[PDB]
Amino acid sequence: AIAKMRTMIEGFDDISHGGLPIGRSTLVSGTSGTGKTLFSIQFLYNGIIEFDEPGVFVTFEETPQDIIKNARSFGWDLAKLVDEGKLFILDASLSALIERINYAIQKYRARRVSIDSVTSVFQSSVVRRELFRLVARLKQIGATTVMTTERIEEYGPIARYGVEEFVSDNVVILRNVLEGERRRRTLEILKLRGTSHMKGEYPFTITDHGINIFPRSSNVRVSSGVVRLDEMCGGGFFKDSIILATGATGTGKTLLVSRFVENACANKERAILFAYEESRAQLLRNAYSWGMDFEEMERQNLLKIVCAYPESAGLEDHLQIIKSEINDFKPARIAIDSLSALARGVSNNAFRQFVIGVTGYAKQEEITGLFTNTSDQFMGAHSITDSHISEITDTIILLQYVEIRGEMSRAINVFKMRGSWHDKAIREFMISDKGPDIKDSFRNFERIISGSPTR
Amino acid sequence: AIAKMRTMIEGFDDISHGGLPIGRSTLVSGTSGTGKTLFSIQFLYNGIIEFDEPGVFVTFEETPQDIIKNARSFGWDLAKLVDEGKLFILDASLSALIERINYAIQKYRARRVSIDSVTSVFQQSSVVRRELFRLVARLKQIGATTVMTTERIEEYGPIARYGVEEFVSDNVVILRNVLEGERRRRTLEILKLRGTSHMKGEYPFTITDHGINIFPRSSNVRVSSGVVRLDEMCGGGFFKDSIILATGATGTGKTLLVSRFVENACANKERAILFAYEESRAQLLRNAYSWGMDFEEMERQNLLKIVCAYPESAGLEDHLQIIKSEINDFKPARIAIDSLSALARGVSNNAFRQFVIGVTGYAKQEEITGLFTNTSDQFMGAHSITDSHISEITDTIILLQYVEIRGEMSRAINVFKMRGSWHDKAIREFMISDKGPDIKDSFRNFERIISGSPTR
Amino acid sequence: AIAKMRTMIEGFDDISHGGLPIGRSTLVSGTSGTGKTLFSIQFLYNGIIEFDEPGVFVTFEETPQDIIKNARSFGWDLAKLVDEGKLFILDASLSALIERINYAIQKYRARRVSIDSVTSVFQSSVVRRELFRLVARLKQIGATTVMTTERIEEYGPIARYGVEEFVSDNVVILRNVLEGERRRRTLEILKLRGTSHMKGEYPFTITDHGINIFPRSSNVRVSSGVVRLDEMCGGGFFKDSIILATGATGTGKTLLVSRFVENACANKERAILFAYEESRAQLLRNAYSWGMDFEEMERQNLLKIVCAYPESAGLEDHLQIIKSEINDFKPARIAIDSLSALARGVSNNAFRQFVIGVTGYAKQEEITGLFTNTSDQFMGAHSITDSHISEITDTIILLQYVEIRGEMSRAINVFKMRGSWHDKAIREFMISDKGPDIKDSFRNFERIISGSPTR
Ligand SMILES: Nc1ncnc2c1ncn2[C@@H]1O[C@H](COP(=O)(O)OP(=O)(O)OP(=O)(O)O)[C@@H](O)[C@H]1O
Ligand SMILES: Nc1ncnc2c1ncn2[C@@H]1O[C@H](COP(=O)(O)OP(=O)(O)OP(=O)(O)O)[C@@H](O)[C@H]1O
Ligand SMILES: Nc1ncnc2c1ncn2[C@@H]1O[C@H](COP(=O)(O)OP(=O)(O)OP(=O)(O)O)[C@@H](O)[C@H]1O
Ligand SMILES: Nc1ncnc2c1ncn2[C@@H]1O[C@H](COP(=O)(O)OP(=O)(O)OP(=O)(O)O)[C@@H](O)[C@H]1O
Ligand SMILES: Nc1ncnc2c1ncn2[C@@H]1O[C@H](COP(=O)(O)OP(=O)(O)OP(=O)(O)O)[C@@H](O)[C@H]1O
Ligand SMILES: Nc1ncnc2c1ncn2[C@@H]1O[C@H](COP(=O)(O)OP(=O)(O)OP(=O)(O)O)[C@@H](O)[C@H]1O
Ligand SMILES: [Mg+2]
Ligand SMILES: [Mg+2]
Ligand SMILES: [Mg+2]
Ligand SMILES: [Mg+2]
Ligand SMILES: [Mg+2]
Ligand SMILES: [Mg+2]
């Protein structure tokens, strides 16, 4: 069994089942601006911070000073690490470098090594023979070195001369796929010789913290803000549960989200509202029109509002922003208004994967999550059957328009409630000031799931 | 930290989170006629017309005079800036250029540099890297923010010509001119920025007389839509800072509402703009007058402005830039787009969504009331409002549907929704006469009136 | 501001916002038989005919005589232009040609120059240096020269060595895209250094007139041929208006087109009928069966019939044929039977673009246009909602079958009428000799928009 060295890169320790094979070199190929350099530095930096192991960085293009300046954007003082003798930047911008690098290892007792764009150290029949020799010389030193190669295509040759993969024992591919004029940073482990790992691409983002690779069940009940909804839900929602508010435009998804967010602040509980449709300006006015002062809850430091457009950033970023905000603010409950706004111009695979990330994080932090969804057919019940994100929600609140005698009346019903009794009736509710009012159901009307009930 | 220098290019300053890394070489690769030269010029020009910094431009193909003449289309007098010593066009049409460029550094405290078509300086990969790496160093030591312009053959292939001008550069900017079904779409993206952060993915930009134009409250004041009943159904009227939507089948009366909405503005001595994409200026004046509203009168009062043209004519990138530019000058109190459906014909849903967001943002960020009309692609109408991905951004939805009543095609209107306001939740039947919309009562006897064919 | 020289090529003067940059060379790349030669000649010819400016043509492959023979197919006597000293064919089938061409310019005082397949003058590192030198020598002469390059792919390298685009100040691409075994001639302006222009491809055709690049509102009312329809329309159709007759096969679209065309000839007005379904033979018989002598109106020189198959020619050609016919005959009104026949096996983008061309030309000539369309679902009302060409028509006449007591009765209704009152009732009409008869509506029948009304 080959031992692995923790890279201390959030995620990579789980995808590589521990980390990188010890005493063996790892290839980190990718297109320009994928994060081949950031990874290589972050690996060494983390090593000379956690495990307190010496790390020698071999540069081939940019100067040893520019690397420290660029790395200063993540708050990593590389000069202090070089001043303490915990890092050695070998300015090399092939046996010469081998002995020069070999000496530097024992000269500083280095445990981790990182080569910067080994592609430039050959500016295919010769690359193999050279790369093979460098892979061997580092194997004899027993130093976990990380190799950086370049690629032209995102779905073509792994390396440049398409031979730097068979020469390496481990292969990590960094991708920046462009889909619908939106860049998506993906990291995958192509191979790991001697050990196991997770296969397929994995959504990652680069922030001020560096690379962010992103690979209970109590009977405690919380209030949704509506006494009738709490009665219909059989004593309100569960604490560590995901609720879903589906319905056609203008049904009252935001109203419910608002009331659900207010109820938290009422019990002095912190709450976050992620808006992707309306603006805080419009949100404050609309909310106030339902006898609810959102500015008040923002002044009590209980409610936090963060609105932004869905086509603005990527799903990978959107998720990172949610987690980050939740980590700082540490809310009791959160609300996403809405999921249907984040799925527009996105692949169903990347949306599903995104939705799994928020619900997983909300459920694994005992946070109540109210996710709103706009129906794409009038019959909202038929929109729930297609919705492949209804198999992840525990509670489903369905809002549907009902054509009643040449009038557009509304209707609410607890479509489902996991491990809890709920009212299985389509109750008619109106909207006014200081919020809504759930009345009775249309017992004398048939096919009320169509949006045009019959007498 | 890496300090960014403002380029004063509308959009790029926000997309690159400040601008271009200070004392670093930025690559700007792109196909022929993408706006590489224009960018490199606009960067320097803005540098000597804002932060008063002497910029040294380098040429490898076209003459220094042609560049001065070519930039005369945007209204930039390079000759005056050259004579003033606030610009140096070094004519170059290996280490020699470095020395001359290195000499031009302290020659006049040169802060901004710009090299054009560097590709031609190695058109007679292994050698291209060694040379490209050298320039990056000589300029890096000079401590001057230079802009490198490379050329590319494929719009979605190699970044540069030898696919090595990106790994040698600290920053990479890609200029695109993709052909979206016999329609060119200019896009700008920041591939990377060694040091700082930036916005990811391609960003719709347009070129005009101003140059490159990269295109990345909530009061309870109510305004009239032209109809008293419609104002009463909206619980007083439309919100000033709100986006209204008129959806319905062809010949429902979307343009009628748009006209009455634009009239009401001019009635209160308010300025209005009508963006027509279906009917002609002359056609709009005849139909309007047939309802009892003189449009020519409103054009003579300098209150209402009519600007109609075909949707297949220009692209969404341009169409939006026109609305913005025409709004900036005229400064309307309220505008109307008739219609959005006419602008979504032979257009990617992704590029259409981005358009509506860009237009609804501007109307909302300028306290302008916007009535956007949309022709429903189904008889149900309400079913079309469900597909409508633009109905989530809309605040008020005015639905217009037909109703087969006793072998007669009668019209019906209803306020589908009204954000942070009460509205009449009834399907009121209305008729059109020689004076405008006449809203009557709803159909209490009839059932399934959302279908388009009810029953008692 | 760079001044532009009018090429006098129908369309190019509007797409290039005036014409080609004066004193600068323009590239006209394209595949074999795109019209690179025709353009180059037509540019010079027009110059030594309108502006009366000398023009020197530099040939590199075919002889100076063959060019005159080929150009004789458009009725351009190049020998007469050479005999008058207004054209000089420099048989060149690189500094040698420069001086030879430079002399010829001042030797004839030429204002426009055209090089024939500059690609053959290099039969990539060398092409640039050569092309750059030729681009400069012509710039010093201050002569608006037009360069012709070749390409292998229609959506690949702009030129052959993919470097003749960055060397040129202006780039015009000629395309002959093959889509569904149908060739579509498209012209686009890739770039114009120093000035503005129209972007994207533009449908053009080659005829006997050469390249044909194809980039009011009175209350006057005309009769449709039916007194009931005129009453239902509120005093007949408008003069400068586009009417639409939609309905399922065998509803009476042709009957209406015929009657509408007859009414013109009745008031001694010229009319054109563009048939794409039935033949003039079948049209004359079917028409005569409705008490209408089409041969009579053809003998009075009032009605003109021109039938042909939709898959025969391209939309670009079909439009050119319509315009040409209208220009000669100068009709008062025209009818297209039908649009649904011209949209079969065509892209919706090219159909839309085609439909915009006919309606624009008909509306900009005070000509009444009756365009018929066959519905693709039984519910014709639902076929009008999909129809993205219903937002361009001012009047819509909908014909729908109605299942009435085990009988297939017909029904007509004025679906819409811009700036005019119309009868908003589904009137039942039968068909017989000397034409149709509109009766009353089915007031005791419900869901008559389905095609199966209920009692
Ligand atoms: N003061 C009010 N009195 C009565 N009804 C109101 C009032 N304010 C809003 N409404 C009703 O509630 C609706 C707004 O509810 P909300 O904004 O939550 O809808 P939604 O279904 O979330 O819409 P979206 O499609 O934007 O997500 C209005 O369209 C209207 O029907
Ligand atoms: N402070 C920061 N916050 C967020 N993202 C950042 C930050 N600094 C850099 N980035 C992102 O990371 C990228 C830097 O990655 P890196 O320098 O490792 O590139 P690379 O993959 O090695 O490419 P190349 O080898 O071609 O230079 C930037 O282009 C940017 O997208
Ligand atoms: N003078 C009039 N008297 C009565 N009804 C009229 C009059 N003028 C127009 N109409 C009616 O109004 C319709 C025109 O409305 P409008 O031009 O707003 O259409 P729309 O709903 O915008 O649809 P589209 O843009 O597809 O034509 C006519 O089709 C007719 O039904
Ligand atoms: N009299 C005519 N009427 C209509 N079309 C014509 C006529 N004469 C020529 N054409 C069309 O124009 C073409 C001639 O174009 P031209 O000779 O300019 O080709 P080209 O694009 O220069 O190609 P190449 O350089 O490969 O010869 C013919 O192939 C035909 O399609
Ligand atoms: N006044 C103007 N108005 C609008 N567009 C203009 C104007 N002037 C130039 N353009 C546009 O910019 C293009 C020229 O831009 P520029 O010269 O920067 O091209 P480029 O990307 O550097 O190409 P290349 O390097 O191949 O010459 C023209 O083809 C045109 O599309
Ligand atoms: N002499 C006649 N008497 C009665 N009905 C007739 C007579 N001639 C034709 N018809 C009716 O009219 C129809 C022909 O009308 P027309 O050719 O205009 O139909 P259309 O809807 O235009 O068909 P297409 O699908 O070919 O476009 C026949 O199918 C029949 O129902
Ligand atoms: Mg790097
Ligand atoms: Mg909402
Ligand atoms: Mg250029
Ligand atoms: Mg309209
Ligand atoms: Mg030819
Ligand atoms: Mg027919």
Q: Which of C10, C50, C53, C61 is catalytic?
A: C61
Per-window interface: C 367-426 vs B, CB < 8 A: 379, 381-382, 384-386, 388, 390-392, 394, 396, 413, 415-421, 424-426
Contact of B31 with B153, CB cutoff 8 Å: yes
Strands B272-276 and B304-306: parallel
Contact of C210 with C339, CB cutoff 8 Å: no
Please name the helix (run of DSSP H) or strand (run of DSSP E) that holds residue B287, with its range, or none: helix B281-291
Contact of A378 with B382, CB cutoff 8 Å: yes
Q: Is A402 helix (H, G, I), strand (E, B) or coil?
A: strand
Burial A183-208 (b: 16+ CB within 10 A, else e): bbbbbbbebbeebebeeeebbbbbee
Domain ranges of chain A: 4-213, 221-441
CA nearest B200: which of B188, B212, B215? B188
The greatest distance separating any two alpha carbons of chain C, rounded to the nearest whole angstrom, comes to 91
Partners of residue B62 in chain C, C-beta under 8 Å: 169, 193
CATH architecture of B222-442: 3-Layer(aba) Sandwich (3.40)
Q: What is the side-by-side order of every strand in the sheet holding A271-275?
A: A303-307, A271-275, A333-337, A368-374, A242-247, A395-403, A408-417, A427-432, A435-441
DSSP C55-113: EEEEESSS-TTHHHHHHTTTT--HHHHHHTTSEEEEE---HHHHHHHHHHHHHHT-SEE
**Angle CA(C326)–CA(C330)–CA(C334) in degrees, nearest 5?**
60
Question: Given B187, B386, B447, which is nearest A375 (Cβ)?
Answer: B386
* HSE-up (13 A, CA, CB side) for residue A189: 24
Omega before residue A450 within 30° of 0, cis:
no
Ligand nearest to the CA of C340: 6
Contact of A55 with A181, CB cutoff 8 Å: no
DSSP B120: G
DSSP A210-247: EE---------EE--S-HHHHHHTTSSEETT-EEEEEE
Nearest CA in chain A to B355: A311
- Other CB atoms within a 10 A radius of the CB of residue A259 amount to 21
Alpha helices in B62-125 (DSSP H): 64-70, 78-83, 95-107
The greatest distance separating any two alpha carbons of chain B, rounded to the nearest whole angstrom, comes to 91
Contact of A374 with A253, CB cutoff 8 Å: yes
Instruction: Classify residue C120 as exposed, middle or buried by CB count within 10 Å of its CB (0-12, 13-18, 19+).
Output: middle
Is B170 an 8 Å CB contact of chain A?
yes
**Interval between CA C114 and ligand 5 midpoint (Å):** 23
Per-window interface: B 119-148 vs C, CB < 8 A: 119-120, 123-124
Contact of B431 with B440, CB cutoff 8 Å: yes
d(CA C423, CA A349): 52
Contact B170 A374 (CB under 8 A): no
Is A31 within any annotated ligand binding site?
A: no
Please name the helix (run of DSSP H) or strand (run of DSSP E) that holds residue C23, with its range, or none: none
Domain A4-213 annotated CATH 3.40.50.300: yes
Contact of B394 with B243, CB cutoff 8 Å: yes
Identify how the structure was determined. X-ray
List chains adjacent to chain B, taking adjacency as at least 3 C-beta pairs closer than 8 Å: A, C
DSSP C355-372: HHHHHHHHHTTT-EEEEE
Alpha helices in A48-165 (DSSP H): 66-71, 78-83, 95-108, 125-141
Partners of residue C388 in chain B, C-beta under 8 Å: 345
**Interval between CA A88 and ligand 10 midpoint (Å):** 71
Mutate to test the pocket of ligand 4, among C27, C36, C45 (most ligand atoms within 8 A of CB): C36
Reading the block at residue B146, the tokens are: 């230079």
Burial A135-168 (b: 16+ CB within 10 A, else e): bebbeebebbbbbbbbbeeeeeebbbeebbbebb
Radius of gyration of chain C (CA): 28
Contact of C30 with C175, CB cutoff 8 Å: yes
For domain B4-214, give the CATH number.
3.40.50.300
d(CA B304, CA B260): 12
* Active site residues per annotation of A: 61, 277
The greatest distance separating any two alpha carbons of chain A, rounded to the nearest whole angstrom, comes to 91
Q: Is C332 helix (H, G, I), strand (E, B) or coil?
A: coil
**Angle CA(C444)–CA(C449)–CA(C455) in degrees, nearest 5?**
25
Contact of C2 with C195, CB cutoff 8 Å: yes
Contact of C409 with C452, CB cutoff 8 Å: no
Q: Is A135 helix (H, G, I), strand (E, B) or coil?
A: helix
Is B253 within any annotated ligand binding site?
A: yes
* HSE-up (13 A, CA, CB side) for residue C413: 23
d(CA A31, CA B159): 10
Domain A221-441 annotated CATH 3.40.50.1370: no
Q: Is A373 in the pocket of ligand 1 (CB under 6 A)?
A: no
Contact B380 A378 (CB under 8 A): yes
Omega before residue A324 within 30° of 0, cis:
no
DSSP B73: G
The answer to whether residue B61 is catalytic is: yes
Partners of residue B382 in chain A, C-beta under 8 Å: 248, 378, 401, 451
- Residues listed for chain B: 456
Contact of C241 with C418, CB cutoff 8 Å: yes
d(CA B368, CA B371): 10
Phi and psi at residue B251, to the nearest 5°: 80, 30
CA nearest B433: which of C261, C367, C421? C421
Is A406 within any annotated ligand binding site?
A: no
CA nearest A266: which of A274, A278, A258, A255? A258
Contact B378 C385 (CB under 8 A): yes
